[PDB]
Amino acid sequence: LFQGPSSTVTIEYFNQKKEMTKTLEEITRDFEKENPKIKVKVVNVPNAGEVLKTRVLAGDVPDVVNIYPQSIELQEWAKAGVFEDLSNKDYLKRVKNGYAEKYAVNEKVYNVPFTANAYGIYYNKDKFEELGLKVPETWDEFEQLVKDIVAKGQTPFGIAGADAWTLNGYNQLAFATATGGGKEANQYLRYSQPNAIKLSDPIMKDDIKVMDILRINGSKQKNWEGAGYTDVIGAFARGDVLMTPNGSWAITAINEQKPNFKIGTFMIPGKEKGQSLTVGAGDLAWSISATTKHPKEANAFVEYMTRPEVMQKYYDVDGSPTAIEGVKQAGEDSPLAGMTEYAFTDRHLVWLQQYWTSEADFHTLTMNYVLTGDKQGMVNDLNAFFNPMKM
Ligand SMILES: [Cl-]
Ligand code: NA
Description:
Layout: E1 9-14, H1 21-34, E2 38-43, H2 48-57, E3 64-66, H3 72-79, E4 112-113, E5 119-124, H4 125-131, H5 139-151, H6 168-179, H7 182-189, H8 202-212, H9 229-238, E6 243-247, H10 250-255, E7 263-266, E8 278-280, E9 285-288, H11 295-306, H12 308-318, H13 337-340, E10 348-350, H14 360-372, H15 375-386
Parallel strand pairs: 1-2, 1-3, 8-10
Antiparallel strand pairs: 3-9, 4-9, 5-6, 5-7
Helix pairs in contact: 6-7, 6-8, 14-15
Sodium ion (NA) binds at residues 93, 325.
PDB class: transport protein
Keywords: Periplasmic binding protein, transport protein
Assembly: monomeric
């Protein structure tokens, strides 16, 4: 006789947020209790981005994939039909206005960004209060703040000279504030002509001005040139430096050092007040295979995570800003409040490398400028990095 399949359906969730897997598996058991005929295999492998590439090109696409939506892989795979078009899903309406669309491919949405990262300046609220200092709201106020801290005999910044990536967000925000936004920054850098970035350009002068805040005499900790990420997390947590520029991801590391002060964040200012910006992209961010055997079950899993009371469970442990409507997010005293105040709005740019072929050399030219102060050299580096993209 004809044999039908099993009554229960199993799907795979290919996770990249290893650190949250436990809460994710918990939420997955909640889903399974609601839906006793669905079982979800939560997969965590090392080198998950490379494994995903191997699996996709082999035609073994997980049913639900955590894929970072700024990635070239998401773009290209989406163009190639690897992922279900989510544009018309009712559950997509639960993502904040306009945000999913920032990752559209041929104007279609292929990914649900549940959470995103952000970037800005961590600062020590206690020390700012003791010193009578205020969060800066313009480039010029930021310059003055750094000078004022130095004059008071303390160290403005922890800078990880050995880990250039730490300043990717800083310099992207220098260019974004200098140009008016993220498209405008990529207009200047990426979509301009070969060799069009010049030291004489007003935009370059402004970028250098913002970078030069990090070059004020006495602005950085001793032996910063060779310092790593953990070294500056520790220096900040200890109160040895008053600020450090980094992403939203850093708060977890800072807390595990047991700081004895109240942590705040602020957005890197623009020239004018009201012009500050942040940058980041989807983190917990899911796509569905276009070739899953179990599309209803895959979609039900994605829908479940869009519900406010489900997303709440993840948000309460993870803490990254969420684009899901109806979640109660942390208050104005929480450490990430300043950095994430304008999350998911016009002022929360997608990482510029969405539209770049690589990024490490941009990190390097940024940190090498902090190290050397060589302005022409930095301009030369920028053209060397962007010229190949402009073939
Ligand atoms: Cl210094
Ligand atoms: Na909505």
